[PDB]
Design a protein around this ligand. Structure first.
Ligand SMILES: CCCCCCCCCCCCCCCCCC(=O)OC[C@H](CO[C@@H]1O[C@H](CO[C@H]2O[C@H](CO)[C@H](O)[C@H](O)[C@H]2O)[C@H](O)[C@H](O)[C@H]1O)OC(=O)CCCCCCCCCCCCCCCCC
Ligand code: CLA
Ligand code: CLA
Ligand code: CLA
Ligand code: CLA
Ligand code: CLA
Ligand code: CLA
Ligand code: CLA
Ligand code: CLA
Ligand SMILES: CC1=C(/C=C/C(C)=C/C=CC(/C)=C/C=C\C=C(C)/C=C/C=C(C)/C=C/C2=C(C)CCCC2(C)C)C(C)(C)CCC1
Ligand code: SF4
Ligand SMILES: [Ca+2]
Lengths: 42, 66, 80, 154, 193, 97, 733, 30
């Protein structure tokens, strides 16, 4: 169990989980706010 | 009398061709035998380009820094 | 032939002589280091320049230095 | 307007691009049935195209002779949303990333094997440090005045 | 002390005339530079104490501002007018060669003499009334001179910057504009246009 | 408007300044400047046969040492200033205020 | 000695073929030859300079000879815009009959090549009119090449070879170069313009027979000694003037009009004569700065010693820099190559925007060829400037004599300089590429409106500052109230403002977002190429990996596989890596220049303004589209005069790809292969009666890098030169 | 007519003489 959690903290797995969460967030941001060449809220 | 610095003290490496030049290391043993041109034994935190972590230096090649 | 030099930073571990593939290095008695021995290059006419000795030196910086010089049949490794 | 450009709400080429794009999608739409799923997909893309063009023309984007939004990064206050404002947002995020990673490297530099926590992440330590980047411009500025940001004599 | 709470620099003791401890950039770090600056400051101070009266006195009369009183040389056939009378040597080449020869000669005499206190306070022929008689009132007048000079230098900066904020104006004309409405005609309108 | 007038006045004033005004400053500055030197020694001593300064032409029975070269230098200043003044007066150029 | 090379014993005693190669590659490295002294060094350099001058004079002499013999110069003067100038004649016995047919052009009897160097326009603008004039210039330069060889030989015998002290006389050399070599030459050129070129440009053929009788000006010389020089500028040529004729001709010889001659579209010949005269007399006065044998002047040593800021932010300033440069010929060559490469690029940027030779702006193939030529020349010169800077640090830099001055301080913080050059290259590279990819993806998905097109508003603001109206920023020269405009309306501003806002020429072309992206690719290329050369020059004496690199020289293979591997660790390898980036940078520069002009000459600047913002547009609308007539130079159905470029086009692709073999594959593979070939020859009957007198070996590691780089560069230059000229001259517009 | 004499004289005879003479000098011994 502790060894399994230590494996999940290795560089590639932490990178995938972190970049997957990051990719999903940016996808939803461009899904609710598509296009946008500017910062429109001024 | 103990020539050179005490063992364990931090030393600023002054040998210009050293991988740890201008850096700092820790003393291991000071060879009190004269005619030994490089008595100061220093151990380093990071390995050099030959994966070596210890080297011998002269007395005028090391400076004691705290 | 290639020039080879030994500097007094040598600790006398006899590693350059073991790695040499053409028997150029020797171990002579000396009084400078703890092992009572230093290296010398008396047969650089057979030296090929592989720098296999420099790859094995633990001194920082190196105590064996191979300065590639005038090429000869022996230094070029020619069997023809 | 600026640099000879005309605002996209005034440009004819800008409106002609919106027309030709929508008419091109409509030309793809006639091939499918009105209740079809490709039809609702193409209709949604058309509505998304209208929304994009309208938003660009509404927020004061300048257009060239090509009918495409050109950005002005000289600092003119009429177009800070085109670079300076998103750039400040980036610099806030970039400083956050660098400051948190720096805090992590400082915290593990005194470990027995500092390389161990660099190839196997200490997630508890990371989760405790990720929110220090929220105040990174302050913590960094104070470390600048106190001599803690730069290593002495390197 | 020019800023209570701040420690004084090491080389500014408080003995020199005008030594209030002002050197944030440490420009007078070198005594050679500091002594040279002590001379150069009095030169700027004295040029300004001659400039400010000459800049605002003709404006009180019918003559225009100092910027328009140096305007005939722009056009070809210029003719200077001291007190409304066209002086015969009003042409620019005449005044230019006259000023070059005289100013270069006199100002170069200051270079050829290094004491270096003669470069600061010469006297002799330049002190006929003999105000340097008492070495206490003479140093008191040194303090009076450097403060009068710094005041005139700050005034010359004001005249030039006001001339930029109102191209083709007079310093006293700007004063009258401020007197018409001090609460609506202030630097705030050129600070916030 | 007269070339001889401008040239004589400009060259006369230039020679006058260089002899009586800008003379001691020029000589003390050329003394502390010194002769150009290669490898810490003059060009001639190093072995340049043609780098020996001509002290015979620098000989002048003038009381202060004004020789031919000083005349040539300050005279070239006077003529260049003279022709600058003449050329600036004949062009008829006028900016716009 | 004993055999070739006689200057290197170690190479002569080489039993392998390596003896020959290294004997050729080290012939001019005088400092490495046996028994070299400082005297022999400067003397061989001196004679080599004379030999080079002889080469240059002979080369120009030959160019005149062929233009006068097989060329079109006499016919080209009559129709400057309808006659294709001839380089020389073609005599290739491999030509088929159609090759003779298609290559016979320009109005000649046999096959000829159309000259694209611009010497026709150059010679017509300076006064040369007949083939006889070109023959006269060729004989004079052939005679000048002769006396160049004469002087070179002369100063190689004793009592004519100068001492090293004479070469180290820097003060006297600068005074003469500024006064005589720079000023007097420019003054005499202004004399040629006002005597032969300007009157030749007004119908008067002034030659050596009648130049003593004609007056360059009706009231000649007189006003020059009075100060009323303006009489030489009273009657310029009318804007409706024909170059070889006199309708509209004037009598002025020194003007400052500022624009172009409307007919020839070249700079005013009076403006050029006045220009050379003004800069000449400025060089003449400036050439009296340093001290010689007359007791006046400056000591460059003392000036360098005096420039030390108190407070020590520059340490000991420039102390010792005089002897540091005056003793190191590599330092002097580094400064010479640096300044020459800058002004070479300056010439490139000005000859296309300010054409000075009559009827050269309409010869579009010539303008493209000239700009490309000088930019690649300047790129190589810049790489050589930094190469010899590193060679100076290894061979000539004395650290104690440069103690704590600006030069040693460069080494003291080498990591700061190299790291920031790396940051700037990373910043430029990351973002410039990213924006290009973003726009590529947008246009892939058919959404051009989502591109990131940044307006180059700072350079647009500068163009408006020069009086251009296309952006309307209302600054000086573009605003009616600024004193910069009022002070110049009398003189150059009429002609200058008339030319800058003409939509035909290339004087400050209109720029858009595409130009913004390409200029940042240029910044990436300059920064990275600078990064490579500077990191190599500063790490040339040593690094943390090899702290004694200065002992191994400038060019060595490596330091072995030890300590992790040390491949390409010398400063020579840094140069070798930077030449790829130089070629890439100049490639970007010239792709930019050629596409903007080839769309301008076609009257279709919108295609460039809309397609240069994404890289698929560069591949499709520039390389692919313009290669049509080129690759059809010869097809299964025949050929035309463009076949010589279609062949050279592929020829350049071959040499370039051949260099990959020397750059990818390395030595040890080929050495073992040659061993298996030596056995084959010794064991083959009949052939074993033939014995090699030099042992076959594989090319050296450094030799391989050089040979691969040379194939790469030759293929680079030849491929682009073939495409450039064929795509431009195929349309001629 | 002159190209029919000088083109082979520099593309055939000249490289032949040049390559042969350079070969003899490079391979020569002392
Ligand atoms: C709404 C309008 C008004 C707003 C007003 C503002 C409100 C902001 C409220 C913030 C807190 C709300 C939620 C707290 C939940 C408890 C989390 C916690 O245990 O919070 C406290 C923790 C730990 O606190 C400190 O954390 C420090 C960080 O070092 C540590 O970092 C790690 C901590 O996990 C490791 O333990 C590691 O070994 C160690 O180096 C030290 O441990 C200190 O001793 C310890 O006191 O930090 C952290 O997680 C910090 C997490 C909170 C960051 C908030 C950022 C907001 C943007
Ligand atoms: C560097 C200048 C130069 C260059 C690049 C060329 C190039 C060319 N010439 Mg030419 N030539 C030159 C100078 C030059 N020439 C001079 C000064 C003369 C005397 C006026 C001639 C007379 C000449 C004739 C009569 C012919 C050519 C021809 C040709 C073409 C065929 C090649 C050839 O025959 O070789 C050149 C042959 C020569 C006799 C020229 C060499 C003699 C001069 C003095 C150069 C000195 C050579 C020297 C021994 C070595 C030079 C060192 C190094 C720089 C090469 C070719 C494109 C032929 C042609 O038209 O092709 C269709 C041809 O018929 N040339
Ligand atoms: C750069 C100079 C140059 C010149 C002037 C020539 C000239 C010629 N080449 Mg050649 N070639 C060259 C370079 C050159 N080449 C190079 C660098 C290559 C390598 C790519 C080639 C490869 C090549 C091939 C493959 C062929 C030619 C052929 C020919 C001939 C075709 C025209 C013809 O039909 O004539 C007349 C045709 C004849 C057969 C008459 C021969 C001419 C007499 C016998 C010459 C006498 C030689 C003389 C005694 C000694 C010469 C060497 C001496 C200077 C030491 C022609 C004379 C063709 C050829 O030779 O035909 C068989 C051909 O097959 N060339
Ligand atoms: C450095 C290069 C670079 C830059 C500056 C941009 C910039 C941009 N891209 Mg782009 N892109 C690039 C490279 C780049 N790209 C490359 C290399 C590719 C190929 C993989 C793409 C492919 C691509 C696509 C397919 C799209 C973009 C889009 C966009 C725009 C969307 C902005 C946005 O996401 O809304 C705003 C997002 C945020 C504000 C997120 C920040 C908020 C954080 C997460 C939280 C804030 C906490 C406080 C934007 C202006 C989109 C577009 O529609 O263009 C208009 C789009 O569809 N890009
Ligand atoms: C904490 C991570 C970190 C930090 C604070 C920095 C900081 C810096 N880097 Mg750097 N770098 C990093 C990681 C980092 N780097 C990594 C992993 C690489 C390998 C790809 C590089 C490769 C690199 C190069 C080649 C250069 C720099 C340079 C620089 C300096 C200029 C800014 C810059 O160009 O950054 C740019 C950043 C990158 C190019 C890559 C960054 C990748 C991410 C964003 C950082 C890693 C974050 C880390 C994984 C988070 C850990 C989370 C933790 C809490 C668990 C700057 C002080 C430049 C320099 O020399 O200064 C003049 C320079 O030339 N860096
Ligand atoms: C070093 C300080 C200084 C300088 C550089 C000037 C310079 C100038 N003054 Mg001024 N002046 C000064 C001090 C100075 N003044 C002081 C202290 C006073 C108060 C007494 C005056 C009172 C004054 C008046 C009343 C006038 C000038 C005028 C002038 C201008 C023309 C002078 C002239 O016609 O020839 C030289 C004159 C004499 C030698 C006498 C000139 C630019 C005249 C002007 O306004 O120009 C149109 C003008 O009428 N000045
Ligand atoms: C006036 C300019 C100038 C001068 C005087 C020198 C002088 C010198 N350089 Mg240098 N250099 C220069 C510019 C200059 N360089 C430039 C612009 C570059 C950038 C390309 C270089 C790059 C450079 C390097 C890397 C090196 C030198 C070296 C040297 C020294 C020895 C050169 C030698 O003997 O090798 C002889 C040179 C040759 C035999 C040339 C053969 C290779 C050429 C390029 C092949 C010809 C191309 C192709 C085959 C022809 C066209 C193809 C055809 C089909 C049309 C020497 C003192 C070397 C040195 O000694 O380092 C300490 C050294 O390694 N230079
Ligand atoms: C007034 C006297 C005088 C003159 C005229 C010269 C002239 C020259 N010297 Mg010399 N020298 C002199 C005095 C003089 N020297 C003295 C007194 C000494 C002792 C200290 C020396 C010691 C000396 C040495 C040691 C050397 C020279 C060298 C040279 C030659 C330089 C190379 C060259 O030709 O580039 C030409 C330069 C120009 C044409 C002017 C600059 C060019 C500009 C920057 C660019 C071109 C302008 C324009 C845009 C071009 C348009 C292009 C179009 C025409 C196609 C040159 C001809 C070198 C040499 O001997 O070569 C054999 C060299 O090694 N000199
Ligand atoms: C090195 C450049 C050069 C040379 C050698 C000449 C040479 C000559 N020029 Mg000329 N000239 C030049 C540049 C040059 N010029 C330039 C740049 C201009 C443009 C301003 C002129 C404009 C010009 C005009 C208008 C005329 C000449 C004339 C002459 C001839 C008589 C000059 C004379 O004896 O006056 C006298 C010499 C002196 C008073 C001593 C000069 C001392 C020197 C400058 C120091 C003469 C052969 C005249 C002529 O006879 O027509 C052919 C004439 O009409 N020149
Ligand atoms: C005896 C005597 C005297 C007298 C003296 C005299 C009088 C002298 C002189 C002198 C002089 C009087 C000199 C001069 C001059 C010099 C020079 C040296 C010159 C010059 C010139 C030039 C250099 C020019 C240039 C130019 C040209 C060429 C053209 C263009 C323009 C110009 C101008 C730039 C007395 C009594 C006093 C004293 C005692 C003695
Ligand atoms: S380079 Fe190789 S052959 Fe030469 S001494 Fe070293 S180990 Fe021996
Ligand atoms: Ca234009």
């Amino acid at each position: 169990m502790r060894d399994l959690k230590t494996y999940l903290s290795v560089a590639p797995v932490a990178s995938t989980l972190w970049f997957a969460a990051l990719a999903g967030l940016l996808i939803e941001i461009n899904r609710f706010f598509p296009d946008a060449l500017t910062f429109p809220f001024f | 009398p103990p020539i050179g610095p005490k063992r364990g003290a931090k030393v600023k490496i002054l040998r210009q061709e050293s991988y740890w030049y201008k850096g700092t290391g820790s003393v291991v043993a000071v060879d009190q035998d004269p005619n030994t041109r490089y008595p100061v034994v220093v151990r380093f935190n990071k390995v050099n380009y030959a994966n070596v972590s210890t080297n011998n230096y002269a007395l005028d090649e090391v400076e004691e820094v705290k | 032939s290639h020039s080879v030099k030994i500097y007094d930073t040598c600790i006398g571990c006899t590693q350059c002589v073991r790695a040499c593939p053409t028997d150029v290095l020797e171990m002579i008695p000396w009084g400078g280091c703890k092992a009572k021995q230093i290296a010398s290059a008396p047969r650089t006419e057979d030296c090929v320049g592989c720098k296999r000795c420099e790859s094995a030196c633990p001194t920082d910086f190196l105590s064996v230095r191979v300065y590639l010089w005038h090429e000869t049949t022996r230094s070029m490794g020619l069997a023809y | 307007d600026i640099a000879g450009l005309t605002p996209c709400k005034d440009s004819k080429q800008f409106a002609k691009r919106e027309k030709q794009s929508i008419k091109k999608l409509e030309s793809s739409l006639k091939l499918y049935a009105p209740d079809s799923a490709p039809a609702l997909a193409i209709n949604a893309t058309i509505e998304k195209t209208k929304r994009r063009f309208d938003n660009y023309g509404k927020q004061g984007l300048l257009c060239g002779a090509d009918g495409l939004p050109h950005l002005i990064v000289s600092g003119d206050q009429r177009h800070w949303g085109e670079f300076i404002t998103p750039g400040i947002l980036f610099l806030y995020i970039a400083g956050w990333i660098g400051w948190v990673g720096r805090s992590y490297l400082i915290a593990i530099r005194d470990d027995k094997k500092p390389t161990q926590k660099e190839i196997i992440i200490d997630v508890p330590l990371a989760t405790g440090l990720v929110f220090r980047g929220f105040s990174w411009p302050i913590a960094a500025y104070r470390e600048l005045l106190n001599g803690e940001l730069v290593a002495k004599d390197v | 002390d020019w800023m209570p709470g701040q420690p004084r620099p090491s080389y500014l003791d408080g003995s020199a005339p005008g030594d209030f401890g002002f050197d944030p950039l440490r420009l007078g770090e070198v005594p050679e530079n500091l002594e040279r600056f002590k001379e150069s400051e009095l030169i700027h101070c004295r040029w300004a104490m001659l400039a400010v009266p000459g800049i605002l006195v003709p404006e009180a009369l019918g003559l225009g501002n100092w910027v328009k009183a140096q305007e005939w040389a722009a056009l070809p056939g210029g003719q200077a007018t001291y007190l409304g009378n066209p002086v015969p040597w009003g042409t620019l080449p005449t005044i230019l060669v006259i000023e070059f020869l005289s100013i270069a000669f006199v100002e170069h005499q200051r270079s050829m003499e290094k004491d270096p206190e003669k470069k600061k306070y010469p006297g002799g022929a330049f002190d006929p009334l003999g105000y340097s008689k008492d070495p206490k009132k003479f140093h008191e007048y040194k303090i009076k001179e450097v403060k009068n000079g710094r005041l005139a230098l700050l005034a010359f900066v004001g005249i030039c910057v006001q001339q930029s904020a109102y191209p083709g104006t007079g310093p006293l004309e700007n004063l009258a504009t401020h007197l018409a409405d001090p609460w609506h005609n202030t630097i705030g309108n050129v600070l916030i246009p | 408007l007269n070339p001889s007038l401008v040239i004589s006045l400009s060259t006369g004033l230039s020679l006058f300044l260089g002899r009586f005004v800008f003379f001691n400053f020029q000589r003390e500055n050329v003394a502390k400047q010194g002769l150009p030197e290669q490898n810490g020694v003059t060009h001639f001593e190093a072995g340049d046969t043609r780098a020996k300064e001509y002290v015979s032409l620098l000989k002048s029975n003038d009381p202060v040492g004004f020789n031919i070269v000083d005349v040539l230098a300050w005279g070239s200043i006077g003529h260049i200033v003279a022709y600058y003044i003449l050329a600036t007066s004949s062009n008829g150029y006028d900016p716009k205020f | 000695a004993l055999r070739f090379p006689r200057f290197s014993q170690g190479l002569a005693q080489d039993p392998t073929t390596r003896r020959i190669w290294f004997g050729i590659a080290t012939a001019h490295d005088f400092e490495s030859h046996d028994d070299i002294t400082e005297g022999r060094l400067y003397q061989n350099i001196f004679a080599s300079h004379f030999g080079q001058l002889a080469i240059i004079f002979l080369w120009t002499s030959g160019n005149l000879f062929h233009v006068a013999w097989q060329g079109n110069f006499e016919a080209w003067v009559q129709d400057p815009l309808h006659v294709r100038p001839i380089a020389h004649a073609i005599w290739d016995p491999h030509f088929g009959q159609p090759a003779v047919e298609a290559f016979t052009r320009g109005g000649a009897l046999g096959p000829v090549n159309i000259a694209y160097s611009g010497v026709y326009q150059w010679w017509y603008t300076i006064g040369l009119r007949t083939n006889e004039d070109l023959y006269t210039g060729a004989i004079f330069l052939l005679f000048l090449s002769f006396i160049s060889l004469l002087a070179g030989w002369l100063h190689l015998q004793p009592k004519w070879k100068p001492s090293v002290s004479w070469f180290k006389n820097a003060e006297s050399r600068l005074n003469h170069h500024l006064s005589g070599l720079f000023g007097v030459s420019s003054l005499a050129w202004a004399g040629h313009l006002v005597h032969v070129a300007i009157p030749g440009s007004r119908g008067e053929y002034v030659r050596w027979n009648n130049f003593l009788s004609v007056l360059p000006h009706p009231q000649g010389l007189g006003p020059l000694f009075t100060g009323q020089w303006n009489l030489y500028a009273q009657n310029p040529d009318s804007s409706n003037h024909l170059f070889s004729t006199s309708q509209g001709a004037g009598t002025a010889i020194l003007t400052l009009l500022g624009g172009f001659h409307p007919q020839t579209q070249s700079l005013w010949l009076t403006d050029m004569a006045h220009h050379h005269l003004a800069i000449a007399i400025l060089f003449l006065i400036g050439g009296h700065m340093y001290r010689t044998n007359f007791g006046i002047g400056h000591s460059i040593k003392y000036i360098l010693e005096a420039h030390i800021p108190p407070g020590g932010r520059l340490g000991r300033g420039h102390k010792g820099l005089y002897d540091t440069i005056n003793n190191s010929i590599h330092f002097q060559l580094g400064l010479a190559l640096a300044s020459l490469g800058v002004i070479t690029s300056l010439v490139a940027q000005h000859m296309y925007s300010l054409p000075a030779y009559a009827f050269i702006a309409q010869d579009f193939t010539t303008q493209a060829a000239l700009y490309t030529h000088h930019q690649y020349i300047a790129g190589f010169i810049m790489t050589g400037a930094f190469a010899h800077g590193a060679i100076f640090f290894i061979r000539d830099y004395n650290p104690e004599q440069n103690a704590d001055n600006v030069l040693a301080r460069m080494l003291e913080h080498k990591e700061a300089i190299i790291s920031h050059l790396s940051w700037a290259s990373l910043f430029l590279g990351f973002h410039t590429l990213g924006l290009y990819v973003h726009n590529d993806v947008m246009l892939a998905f058919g959404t051009p409106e989502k591109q990131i097109l940044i307006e180059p508003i700072f350079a647009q603001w500068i163009q408006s500052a020069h009086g251009k109206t296309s952006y309307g920023f209302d600054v000086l020269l573009s605003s009616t109230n600024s004193p910069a405009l009022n002070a110049g309306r009398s003189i150059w501003l009429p002609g200058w403002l008339n030319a800058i806002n003409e939509n035909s020429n290339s004087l400050f072309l209109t720029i858009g977002p595409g130009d913004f992206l390409v200029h940042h690719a240029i910044a990436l290329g300059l920064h990275t190429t600078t990064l490579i050369l500077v990191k190599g020059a500063l790490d040339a004496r040593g690094s943390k990996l090899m702290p004694d690199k200065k002992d191994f020289g400038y060019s060595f293979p490596c330091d072995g596989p030890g300590r992790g591997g040390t491949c390409d660790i010398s400063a020579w390898d840094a140069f070798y890596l930077a030449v790829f980036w130089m070629l890439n940078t100049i490639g970007w520069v010239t792709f930019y220049w050629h596409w903007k002009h080839i769309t301008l000459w076609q009257g279709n600047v919108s295609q460039f303004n809309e397609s240069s913002t994404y890289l698929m547009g560069w591949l499709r609308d520039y390389l692919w589209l313009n290669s049509s007539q080129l690759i059809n130079g010869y097809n299964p159905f025949g050929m035309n005069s463009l076949s010589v470029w279609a062949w050279m086009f592929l020829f350049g692709h071959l040499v370039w790809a051949t260099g990959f073999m020397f750059l990818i594959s390395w030595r040890g593979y080929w050495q073992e292969l040659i061993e298996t070939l030596a056995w084959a020859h010794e064991r083959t009957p009949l052939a074993n009666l033939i014995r090699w007198r030099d042992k076959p070996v594989a090319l050296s590691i450094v030799q391989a890098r050089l040979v691969g780089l040379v194939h790469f560069s030759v293929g680079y230059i030849f491929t682009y030169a073939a495409f450039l000229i064929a795509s431009t001259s195929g349309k001629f517009g | 007519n002159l190209p029919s004499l000088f083109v082979p004289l520099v593309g055939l005879l000249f490289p032949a003489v040049a390559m042969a003479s350079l070969f003899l000098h490079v391979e020569k011994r002392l």
